[PDB]
């Protein structure tokens, strides 16, 4: 019957995709080692979908049937063109624009005043944001996830410095006039942070704190439970499972 | 009860961290090492050797350089307490014996 | 991409433990005497 034919088909498709991804990762590691046979084509590593799933989708579809990111039309045809998936992160032009205005504002402030914190915390963060915006131009890969994480880290550091320490060139005579506060730069960096969180940050979710022995107390894997036992220093405690 | 069940299945690590790890294996060793080094005099035995023996007896593990208790006893112990004395003695006995200064 | 085929052409050339403490209350309560005395 259905709802179990469908479940079995989804399980088979997911397992085939996992096996294909593992196979191309291991084949990549062996081809970079020069341990591949002569018939191997590294262009096969550009085949993202599993071949069997690609064939099944071919069978299904044969038996059934302001100027950024991409183009732009502006109130004539294709009006909702910004929402089309162009391949990049939504916040790419926002982080590139923020990098540009941060570098320009830092250089201008250091020229106008003489303080070197505006240029050092200016262009220095703008280069990191520009690299993150370059890495976010293909937001379907590990460089895309790393770019959005680096951009969030830079903007969060800007917000933290602004609301905790403050800006050196903004130092004034009175203690109440010093007042680190949250000005337009901190507001823009916090808005970029919220934009990253509310558009896309999932990816590299395998990197977290190592699993506790409390995770694997009810785990059905004796080997995994014993591995966590041994890694967390217990090791010789009787398992009795 | 449904929400408690859901949250208990979600967390499963933070509960072990807060019930087993956070005091007994994270905060309490730090507190007792800092407290001992704050209490005992600036002596080699009281700052290094006696806490080494007491930690070995209390925990069953000798503070090997791969163990954070060794580094806590090296910083808050040797470095903070007996290293000034060692420094003075060294700069007045060994450093000239090495031909320097 | 624009340099997809050119890049293809030129690339094809034309210990076991954690750094964590051990509990000291598994054998004695005596380590708890340092906290109030130091406080």
């Amino acid at each position: 019957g259905d709802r179990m034919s469908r479940r079995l088909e989804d399980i088979n498709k997911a397992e085939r995709q996992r096996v294909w991804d593992a196979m191309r990762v291991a084949a990549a590691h062996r081809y970079a080692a020069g341990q591949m046979p002569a018939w191997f084509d590294p262009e096969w590593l550009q085949q993202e979908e599993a071949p069997l799933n690609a064939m099944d989708r071919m069978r299904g579809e044969q038996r059934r049937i302001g100027g950024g990111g991409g183009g732009g039309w502006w109130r004539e045809d294709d009006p909702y063109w910004p929402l089309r998936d162009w391949g990049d992160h939504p916040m790419r032009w926002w982080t590139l624009a923020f990098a540009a205005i941060m570098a320009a504002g830092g250089l201008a402030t250091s020229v106008a005043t003489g303080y070197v914190e505006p240029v050092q915390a200016g262009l220095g963060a703008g280069s990191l944001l520009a690299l993150a915006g370059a890495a976010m131009s293909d937001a379907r890969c590990v460089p895309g996830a790393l770019g959005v994480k680096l951009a969030w880290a830079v903007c969060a550091l800007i917000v933290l410095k602004e609301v905790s320490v403050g800006w050196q060139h903004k130092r004034k005579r009175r203690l109440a006039a010093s007042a680190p506060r949250l000005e337009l730069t901190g507001l823009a960096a916090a808005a970029l942070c919220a934009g990253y969180m509310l558009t896309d940050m999932s990816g590299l979710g395998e990197v977290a704190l190592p699993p506790n022995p409390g995770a694997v107390f009810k785990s059905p894997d004796v080997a995994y439970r014993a591995s966590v036992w041994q890694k967390w220093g217990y090791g010789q405690v009787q398992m009795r499972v | 009860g449904e929400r408690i069940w859901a949250w208990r299945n979600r967390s499963e690590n933070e509960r072990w961290f807060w019930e087993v790890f956070a005091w007994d294996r994270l905060i309490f060793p730090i507190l007792v090492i800092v407290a001992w080094e704050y209490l005992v005099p600036n002596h080699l035995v009281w700052a290094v050797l006696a806490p080494l023996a007491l930690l070995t007896w209390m925990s069953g593990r000798l503070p090997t350089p791969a163990t954070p208790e060794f580094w806590m006893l090296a910083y808050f112990g040797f470095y903070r307490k007996v290293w000034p004395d060692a420094a003075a003695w060294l700069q007045g006995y060994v450093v000239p014996l090495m031909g320097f200064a | 991409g624009t340099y997809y085929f050119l890049q293809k052409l030129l690339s094809k050339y034309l210990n076991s433990l954690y750094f964590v403490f051990t509990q000291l209350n598994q054998k004695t309560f005596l380590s708890y005497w340092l906290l109030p005395v130091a406080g």
Binding site: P213, F217, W229, W232, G233, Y234, V237, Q238 | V20, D24 | T22, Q23, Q26
Partner: peptide
């Protein structure tokens, strides 16, 4: 270490 901890 301790049995009840794990």
């Amino acid at each position: 270490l301790n049995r009840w901890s794990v």
